[PDB]
Amino acid sequence: ATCATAWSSSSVYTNGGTVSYNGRNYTAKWWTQNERPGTSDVWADKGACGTGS
Numbered sequence: 454a455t456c457a458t459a460w461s462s463s464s465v466y467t468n469g470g471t472v473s474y475n476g477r478n479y480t481a482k483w484w485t486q487n488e489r490p491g492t493s494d495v496w497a498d499k500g501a502c503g504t505g506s
Contacts, residue, residue: 460472467484
């Protein structure tokens with residue numbers, strides 16, 4: 454139901470930009486280029502991602 458678009462290295466994100474990864478959802482704080490979310494302070498888990506596998 455609710456889940457941000459999975460992170461995309463081919464799509465620069467910015468403040469407010471939300472995405473999904475590792476089953477959770479990450480939210481950036483400002484302009485950021487292709488970078489592994491969760492490993493950098495840039496991306497922070499703002500919840501969980503709902504999906505079926």
